Short mmCIF file of N, CA and C in Angstrom, two decimals:
data_model
loop_
_atom_site.label_atom_id
_atom_site.label_comp_id
_atom_site.label_asym_id
_atom_site.label_seq_id
_atom_site.Cartn_x
_atom_site.Cartn_y
_atom_site.Cartn_z
N UNK A 29 97.29 93.30 97.65
CA UNK A 29 97.34 92.47 98.93
C UNK A 29 96.41 93.35 100.18
N UNK A 30 96.79 94.61 100.00
CA UNK A 30 95.46 95.38 100.90
C UNK A 30 94.41 96.44 100.40
N UNK A 31 94.05 97.22 101.04
CA UNK A 31 92.92 98.32 100.47
C UNK A 31 93.15 98.97 101.09
N UNK A 32 93.76 99.92 102.43
CA UNK A 32 94.02 101.41 102.75
C UNK A 32 95.54 100.76 104.19
N UNK A 33 96.17 102.12 103.99
CA UNK A 33 97.14 102.32 104.27
C UNK A 33 96.49 103.26 105.74
N UNK A 34 96.42 103.21 107.51
CA UNK A 34 96.49 104.26 108.49
C UNK A 34 97.77 104.44 108.97
N UNK A 35 99.13 104.47 108.82
CA UNK A 35 99.13 104.67 109.10
C UNK A 35 100.82 105.49 108.70
N UNK A 36 101.97 105.80 110.08
CA UNK A 36 102.69 107.50 108.98
C UNK A 36 103.69 107.75 108.04
N UNK A 37 102.27 107.44 106.58
CA UNK A 37 103.29 107.22 106.20
C UNK A 37 103.11 108.76 105.24
N UNK A 38 104.43 108.78 104.55
CA UNK A 38 104.25 110.09 103.99
C UNK A 38 103.94 110.44 102.49
N UNK A 39 103.23 112.15 102.52
CA UNK A 39 103.01 112.16 100.97
C UNK A 39 104.38 112.35 100.04
N UNK A 40 103.99 112.61 99.38
CA UNK A 40 105.33 113.04 97.86
C UNK A 40 104.95 112.41 96.73
N UNK A 41 105.42 113.57 95.59
CA UNK A 41 105.02 113.42 94.17
C UNK A 41 105.16 111.66 93.54
N UNK A 42 106.41 110.79 93.77
CA UNK A 42 106.05 109.46 92.96
C UNK A 42 104.96 109.22 93.46
N UNK A 43 105.10 109.21 94.59
CA UNK A 43 103.54 108.20 95.50
C UNK A 43 101.90 108.30 94.88
N UNK A 44 101.88 109.79 94.60
CA UNK A 44 100.53 109.97 94.26
C UNK A 44 100.90 109.61 93.08
N UNK A 45 101.98 109.88 92.32
CA UNK A 45 101.11 109.48 90.71
C UNK A 45 101.00 107.72 90.64
N UNK A 46 100.75 106.72 91.86
CA UNK A 46 100.01 105.33 91.82
C UNK A 46 99.41 105.65 92.86
N UNK A 47 98.88 105.91 93.66
CA UNK A 47 98.35 106.04 94.90
C UNK A 47 97.25 107.21 94.84
N UNK A 48 96.31 107.66 95.33
CA UNK A 48 95.38 108.46 96.24
C UNK A 48 95.56 108.78 97.53
N UNK A 49 95.99 110.05 97.63
CA UNK A 49 96.37 110.04 99.73
C UNK A 49 95.34 111.03 99.69
N UNK A 50 94.90 111.43 101.04
CA UNK A 50 94.35 111.62 101.35
C UNK A 50 94.89 113.41 102.02
N UNK A 51 94.45 114.65 103.06
CA UNK A 51 94.82 115.84 103.48
C UNK A 51 95.00 115.44 103.94
N UNK A 52 96.81 116.04 105.01
CA UNK A 52 97.72 115.29 105.94
C UNK A 52 96.52 115.53 107.30
N UNK A 53 97.57 114.27 108.19
CA UNK A 53 96.13 114.21 109.37
C UNK A 53 97.55 114.94 110.71
N UNK A 54 98.61 115.31 109.95
CA UNK A 54 99.98 115.87 110.86
C UNK A 54 100.94 116.22 109.66
N UNK A 55 101.93 117.20 110.31
CA UNK A 55 102.11 118.01 109.53
C UNK A 55 103.75 117.79 110.02
N UNK A 56 104.82 117.80 109.41
CA UNK A 56 106.45 117.67 109.81
C UNK A 56 107.19 118.62 108.96
N UNK A 57 108.61 118.18 109.52
CA UNK A 57 110.06 118.50 108.75
C UNK A 57 110.43 117.09 108.80
N UNK A 58 111.35 117.08 108.03
CA UNK A 58 113.06 116.10 107.87
C UNK A 58 113.46 117.12 109.21
N UNK A 59 114.11 116.43 109.81
CA UNK A 59 114.89 117.14 111.21
C UNK A 59 116.46 116.48 111.48
N UNK A 60 117.07 116.54 112.45
CA UNK A 60 118.45 116.10 112.58
C UNK A 60 118.50 115.80 113.97
N UNK A 61 118.81 114.49 114.11
CA UNK A 61 118.74 113.65 116.03
C UNK A 61 119.95 113.47 115.60
N UNK A 62 120.17 114.00 117.43
CA UNK A 62 122.40 113.59 117.73
C UNK A 62 121.71 113.23 119.46
N UNK A 63 123.18 112.86 120.05
CA UNK A 63 122.99 112.69 121.04
C UNK A 63 123.57 113.76 121.96
N UNK A 64 121.82 114.59 122.46
CA UNK A 64 122.90 115.08 123.54
C UNK A 64 124.14 115.84 124.35
N UNK A 65 124.83 116.80 123.97
CA UNK A 65 125.99 116.73 124.33
C UNK A 65 125.64 116.73 126.52
N UNK A 66 126.60 116.80 127.29
CA UNK A 66 126.76 117.19 128.23
C UNK A 66 126.75 118.85 128.72
N UNK A 67 126.27 118.34 130.29
CA UNK A 67 126.10 119.55 130.76
C UNK A 67 127.46 120.38 131.39
N UNK A 68 128.16 121.75 130.91
CA UNK A 68 128.92 122.59 131.42
C UNK A 68 129.81 122.07 132.87
N UNK A 69 130.63 122.23 132.63
CA UNK A 69 131.66 122.32 134.04
C UNK A 69 131.81 124.57 134.23
N UNK A 70 131.59 124.70 135.67
CA UNK A 70 132.32 126.47 135.72
C UNK A 70 133.06 126.60 134.80
N UNK A 71 134.49 126.25 134.88
CA UNK A 71 135.63 126.42 134.23
C UNK A 71 136.57 126.75 134.82
N UNK A 72 137.66 127.13 134.74
CA UNK A 72 139.16 127.69 135.17
C UNK A 72 138.67 129.00 134.54
N UNK A 73 139.15 130.42 135.36
CA UNK A 73 139.11 130.86 134.73
C UNK A 73 137.62 131.44 134.10
N UNK A 74 136.81 131.04 135.75
CA UNK A 74 135.12 131.57 135.01
C UNK A 74 134.83 133.21 136.37
N UNK A 75 136.26 133.16 137.10
CA UNK A 75 136.01 134.28 137.95
C UNK A 75 136.01 135.21 136.95
N UNK A 76 136.53 135.79 135.93
CA UNK A 76 136.24 136.92 134.54
C UNK A 76 134.60 136.66 134.22
N UNK A 77 134.02 136.05 134.30
CA UNK A 77 132.76 135.93 133.73
C UNK A 77 132.19 137.35 133.30
N UNK B 21 91.65 127.72 76.71
CA UNK B 21 93.51 128.12 76.99
C UNK B 21 93.20 128.79 78.06
N UNK B 22 93.41 130.09 78.27
CA UNK B 22 93.80 130.34 78.83
C UNK B 22 92.00 130.74 80.13
N UNK B 23 93.72 130.94 81.35
CA UNK B 23 92.76 130.50 82.51
C UNK B 23 91.82 132.37 83.39
N UNK B 24 91.27 132.14 83.44
CA UNK B 24 90.67 133.59 84.53
C UNK B 24 91.45 132.86 86.24
N UNK B 25 91.96 133.96 85.72
CA UNK B 25 92.62 133.91 88.01
C UNK B 25 92.11 134.07 88.91
N UNK B 26 91.85 134.15 89.62
CA UNK B 26 91.38 134.85 91.14
C UNK B 26 92.30 135.41 92.01
N UNK B 27 92.20 136.32 92.25
CA UNK B 27 93.14 136.96 93.62
C UNK B 27 92.76 137.77 94.47
N UNK B 28 93.20 138.05 95.22
CA UNK B 28 92.97 139.09 96.45
C UNK B 28 94.55 140.54 96.73
N UNK B 29 94.22 141.22 97.03
CA UNK B 29 95.51 142.51 97.56
C UNK B 29 95.89 141.71 99.55
N UNK B 30 96.66 140.55 99.40
CA UNK B 30 96.93 140.80 100.86
C UNK B 30 98.52 140.08 101.13
N UNK B 31 98.86 141.05 101.03
CA UNK B 31 100.75 141.72 100.67
C UNK B 31 101.03 140.24 101.69
N UNK B 32 102.15 139.83 101.36
CA UNK B 32 102.68 140.02 100.06
C UNK B 32 102.18 139.22 99.42
N UNK B 33 101.35 138.87 99.12
CA UNK B 33 100.87 137.92 98.22
C UNK B 33 100.72 138.45 96.56
N UNK B 34 99.71 139.12 97.10
CA UNK B 34 99.50 140.10 96.52
C UNK B 34 99.83 141.64 96.18
N UNK B 35 100.18 142.10 95.08
CA UNK B 35 100.38 143.86 96.07
C UNK B 35 100.94 144.78 94.47
N UNK B 36 99.96 145.85 94.59
CA UNK B 36 99.83 146.62 92.30
C UNK B 36 101.27 146.51 92.82
N UNK B 37 102.40 147.36 91.79
CA UNK B 37 103.54 148.31 91.32
C UNK B 37 103.41 149.76 91.75
N UNK B 38 105.10 150.04 91.61
CA UNK B 38 104.34 150.86 92.30
C UNK B 38 104.64 151.72 91.23
N UNK B 39 104.18 153.12 90.87
CA UNK B 39 103.22 153.69 89.71
C UNK B 39 103.01 152.61 88.18
N UNK B 40 102.11 152.04 89.35
CA UNK B 40 101.13 150.93 88.37
C UNK B 40 100.17 151.36 87.24
N UNK B 41 100.07 152.99 87.37
CA UNK B 41 99.39 153.58 86.94
C UNK B 41 99.76 153.20 84.88
N UNK B 42 101.16 153.47 85.20
CA UNK B 42 102.05 152.80 83.50
C UNK B 42 101.13 151.63 83.11
N UNK B 43 101.35 150.70 83.93
CA UNK B 43 101.19 149.57 83.85
C UNK B 43 99.21 148.75 83.66
N UNK B 44 100.11 148.00 82.44
CA UNK B 44 98.66 147.76 82.31
C UNK B 44 98.62 146.09 82.12
N UNK B 45 97.36 145.09 82.28
CA UNK B 45 96.53 143.98 81.73
C UNK B 45 97.80 142.87 82.88
N UNK B 46 98.71 142.00 82.47
CA UNK B 46 99.03 141.91 84.04
C UNK B 46 100.42 141.95 85.08
N UNK B 47 100.63 143.28 84.09
CA UNK B 47 101.73 143.41 84.81
C UNK B 47 101.76 144.09 85.94
N UNK B 48 100.64 145.44 86.08
CA UNK B 48 100.64 145.42 87.42
C UNK B 48 100.14 145.40 88.77
N UNK B 49 100.07 144.09 88.80
CA UNK B 49 99.99 143.04 90.09
C UNK B 49 101.78 142.65 89.86
N UNK C 20 82.54 132.50 87.57
CA UNK C 20 82.75 133.57 87.05
C UNK C 20 83.88 133.72 86.75
N UNK C 21 84.87 132.21 87.64
CA UNK C 21 86.41 132.19 87.04
C UNK C 21 87.30 130.83 87.02
N UNK C 22 87.91 130.29 86.89
CA UNK C 22 88.73 129.10 86.74
C UNK C 22 89.63 128.36 87.85
N UNK C 23 90.22 129.09 88.78
CA UNK C 23 91.15 128.71 89.76
C UNK C 23 91.39 130.05 90.35
N UNK C 24 92.31 129.70 91.25
CA UNK C 24 92.15 130.78 92.08
C UNK C 24 93.96 130.10 92.75
N UNK C 25 95.19 131.17 91.85
CA UNK C 25 95.94 130.99 92.92
C UNK C 25 96.70 132.20 93.56
N UNK C 26 95.48 132.08 94.58
CA UNK C 26 95.95 132.85 95.60
C UNK C 26 95.63 132.14 97.16
N UNK C 27 96.50 133.67 98.43
CA UNK C 27 96.27 133.02 99.52
C UNK C 27 95.16 132.28 100.13
N UNK C 28 95.07 130.85 99.35
CA UNK C 28 93.29 131.04 99.74
C UNK C 28 92.72 129.39 100.96
N UNK C 29 93.27 130.33 102.30
CA UNK C 29 93.15 128.68 103.07
C UNK C 29 92.02 127.62 102.69
N UNK C 30 92.71 126.46 103.59
CA UNK C 30 92.01 125.30 103.48
C UNK C 30 90.77 125.18 104.31
N UNK C 31 89.39 124.44 103.60
CA UNK C 31 88.89 124.30 104.86
C UNK C 31 88.03 122.60 104.97
N UNK C 32 87.02 122.11 105.53
CA UNK C 32 86.07 121.49 105.45
C UNK C 32 85.28 121.96 104.28
N UNK C 33 84.68 123.15 104.60
CA UNK C 33 83.06 123.61 103.92
C UNK C 33 83.80 123.56 102.11
N UNK C 34 84.57 124.25 102.25
CA UNK C 34 85.26 124.46 101.26
C UNK C 34 84.56 123.79 99.60
N UNK C 35 85.91 122.90 100.39
CA UNK C 35 86.39 122.12 99.80
C UNK C 35 84.88 120.80 99.72
N UNK C 36 83.50 120.54 100.13
CA UNK C 36 82.78 120.40 99.72
C UNK C 36 81.87 120.50 97.95
N UNK C 37 82.62 122.29 98.90
CA UNK C 37 82.23 122.35 97.04
C UNK C 37 82.77 122.91 95.81
N UNK C 38 84.30 122.65 96.28
CA UNK C 38 84.94 123.00 95.10
C UNK C 38 86.74 121.94 95.41
N UNK C 39 87.11 121.74 94.87
CA UNK C 39 88.45 121.15 95.12
C UNK C 39 89.48 121.55 94.96
N UNK C 40 90.55 121.76 96.09
CA UNK C 40 91.60 122.38 96.31
C UNK C 40 92.86 120.98 96.30
N UNK C 41 93.75 121.82 96.11
CA UNK C 41 95.17 120.89 95.75
C UNK C 41 95.83 120.71 97.24
N UNK C 42 97.92 120.23 97.23
CA UNK C 42 98.43 120.12 98.14
C UNK C 42 98.27 121.73 98.50
N UNK C 43 98.97 121.71 100.05
CA UNK C 43 99.17 122.87 100.06
C UNK C 43 100.18 123.54 99.77
N UNK C 44 100.55 124.25 99.23
CA UNK C 44 102.18 125.26 98.93
C UNK C 44 102.68 126.02 99.88
N UNK C 45 101.80 126.39 100.83
CA UNK C 45 102.59 126.51 102.23
C UNK C 45 101.89 126.15 103.52
N UNK C 46 102.30 125.48 104.86
CA UNK C 46 101.26 125.75 105.58
C UNK C 46 102.00 126.40 106.89
N UNK C 47 100.94 127.08 107.41
CA UNK C 47 100.75 127.98 108.03
C UNK C 47 99.58 127.57 109.58
N UNK C 48 99.30 128.47 110.54
CA UNK C 48 98.42 128.43 111.90
C UNK C 48 98.24 129.46 111.78
N UNK C 49 96.65 129.90 112.45
CA UNK C 49 96.01 130.95 113.43
C UNK C 49 97.14 131.82 114.47
N UNK C 50 97.19 133.13 114.44
CA UNK C 50 97.75 132.90 115.68
C UNK C 50 97.87 134.64 116.15
N UNK C 51 98.27 135.37 116.85
CA UNK C 51 97.76 136.64 117.42
C UNK C 51 99.16 137.66 117.72
N UNK C 52 98.67 138.60 117.04
CA UNK C 52 99.05 139.60 116.32
C UNK C 52 98.94 140.87 118.12
N UNK C 53 99.14 141.80 118.92
CA UNK C 53 99.13 142.39 119.35
C UNK C 53 100.17 143.94 119.27
N UNK C 54 100.94 144.91 119.56
CA UNK C 54 101.27 146.45 119.60
C UNK C 54 102.71 145.65 120.17
N UNK C 55 103.80 146.85 119.85
CA UNK C 55 104.77 146.05 120.55
C UNK C 55 105.46 147.19 121.83
N UNK C 56 119.24 149.69 124.12
CA UNK C 56 120.51 150.31 124.33
C UNK C 56 120.76 151.00 125.90
N UNK C 57 121.83 150.59 127.03
CA UNK C 57 121.74 151.96 128.45
C UNK C 57 122.15 152.93 127.78
N UNK C 58 121.63 153.63 128.58
CA UNK C 58 122.63 155.27 128.64
C UNK C 58 123.72 155.24 128.51
N UNK C 59 124.48 156.53 128.49
CA UNK C 59 126.61 156.04 128.90
C UNK C 59 126.48 155.79 130.19
N UNK C 60 126.10 157.15 130.83
CA UNK C 60 125.79 157.39 132.78
C UNK C 60 124.60 156.47 132.97
N UNK C 61 124.63 155.39 132.86
CA UNK C 61 123.32 154.03 132.79
C UNK C 61 123.91 153.45 134.41
N UNK C 62 125.04 153.74 134.60
CA UNK C 62 125.21 152.90 135.98
C UNK C 62 125.44 153.59 137.39
N UNK C 63 124.07 155.03 136.58
CA UNK C 63 123.37 156.18 138.03
C UNK C 63 121.88 156.48 138.36
N UNK C 64 121.36 154.82 137.40
CA UNK C 64 120.21 154.24 137.53
C UNK C 64 120.10 153.41 138.53
#
């Protein structure tokens, strides 16, 4: 249905067995995303810090 | 079948063994 | 004079024009290298 993929496609062994990739144009890695926690309030008994 | 393998001594990738004087062939690396 | 290079060889455009590289087995980047506890009675400093 097409001829090329200029996309954020990720390289891997399985896809190479069926199609020809190029040299990576940007490097990356899996990572974890979380809801940035809120800032901290001083705290009772912080006068000992 | 046998492969001609090229390398250079760029640690820690390739470095000679301690007392490699007693080692011969591929074991000295 | 040889047939393969299992080495810390770096990929680049020029070398690919003449030889065939593989998928990188480790990633890297250029970087710069430079030369690099309080005492007991340190409250007098």
